[PDB]
Design a protein around this ligand. Structure first.
Ligand SMILES: [Ca+2]
Ligand SMILES: [Cl-]
Lengths: 242, 245
């Protein structure tokens, strides 16, 4: 079931914003959120789509392994970290859109649609550019739907090879210490209103796993760090992390 | 500057500062070159102690003794000195807390014949497991040097060991120790505390955006009070060489 804890809204309004956090306790099969309506509202996934895009590119052989080098095309884009060679690990880390646009072109519309239907990923609608539909096209996915998809990935239940799922979970690694491991992906939907930031993933503990998906209003890029900061505030307050 | 192995005695100051002695060995994967404060000790073979949990994990996975990283190894109900051992574990947490009893059971199930054959294929150390099948890495005959640990770890990193790619990916997951926006460390600690010379170990690697740095260190450990020096001295070297900030 789901519990709504409206008191968590303060975590957003104290930053002059609005948003949703969704938590899932895997051992207890219990969900929590500050806002049930928005937890189930579907938005563009923006660069959180790099999780399914990575899986499809690996399973089909577009990407051989996490070491294959994708050479910079020599065109200088706005984010300096994009203007260099990458592998799957660093393309995820710096959210290198052009590398993933090339993945999508090579996958093709037909195979992309077939795979997203098999994943049950959002509204499964890739209209718009084959190479940008997750940024300004027709695909929409909610925070609760992100949890469902991530749970399948965590348990190697998606209809792609076990190897592809293990490689993407490695590439999602974001933080690790003696208390917890976070595997996750950020997103920033900055073209189509409502402009929002995403953070989706999970926290591995010794004894349990907490899945999470959050999004928040993002009228400018100045607030992007609040995606992880707000989430961690909630995790700390609830004694999931120290 | 073309030498495969180069001695840099300036790192000794990190040992001297902590009234300690030992060896740090680094390997720059992009440049295929190595660095150490003590070439002689870098090539001296010691009991691996709990750094042996890396090969032991690989063998148990590949033979099916361990199904995967979620299988639960129930506590046998016997209360031992390290409190974190006295509970149920999986591969991730058994590696993290270095739960010896779990891996002793692994070794008994693998058996001496299959254990010997696998270490031979791994070319691991002196490949000699005389002693108890269940404790030879703690007080038996197997010995491995720091440079030999590097070579073995490089094989693991590239999935070049003879076991399945899946077994190798799982163990590399279980070796995860630290990760942030600057680096990822996959490593395993050890403490040889039964047979002289008593020593501590830390072996593994540091993943950067555009390179990997393998490391293996051991140091004299007359009592357990200095165990934190294994990571501290290693990190002091990594900082001096600008590998981590
Ligand atoms: Ca595959
Ligand atoms: Cl990992």
């Amino acid at each position: 079931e789901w519990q709504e804890n409206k008191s968590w809204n303060a975590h957003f309004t104290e930053h002059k914003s609005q948003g949703v956090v969704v938590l899932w306790n895997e051992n207890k099969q219990q969900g929590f959120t500050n806002n049930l309506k928005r937890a189930n509202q579907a938005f563009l996934p923006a660069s959180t789509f790099k999780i399914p895009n990575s899986l499809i590119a690996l399973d089909l052989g577009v990407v051989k392994d996490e070491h294959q080098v994708f050479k910079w095309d020599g065109q200088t884009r706005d984010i300096a970290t994009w203007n260099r060679d990458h592998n799957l690990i660093t393309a995820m880390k710096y959210s290198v859109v052009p590398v993933y646009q090339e993945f999508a072109r090579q996958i093709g519309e037909a195979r992309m649609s077939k795979m997203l239907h098999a994943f049950d990923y959002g509204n499964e609608d890739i209209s718009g550019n084959v190479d940008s539909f997750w940024l300004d096209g027709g695909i929409r996915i909610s925070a609760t739907e992100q949890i469902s998809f991530l749970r399948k990935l965590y348990h190697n239940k998606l209809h792609v090879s076990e190897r592809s799922q293990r490689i993407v979970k490695q590439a999602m690694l974001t933080e690790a210490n003696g208390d917890y491991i976070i595997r996750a992906k950020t997103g920033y939907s900055c073209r189509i209103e409502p402009k929002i930031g995403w953070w989706v993933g999970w926290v591995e503990l010794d004894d349990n796993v907490w899945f999470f998906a959050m999004n928040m209003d993002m009228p400018t890029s100045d607030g992007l760090g609040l995606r992880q900061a707000i989430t961690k505030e909630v995790l700390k307050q609830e004694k999931i992390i120290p």
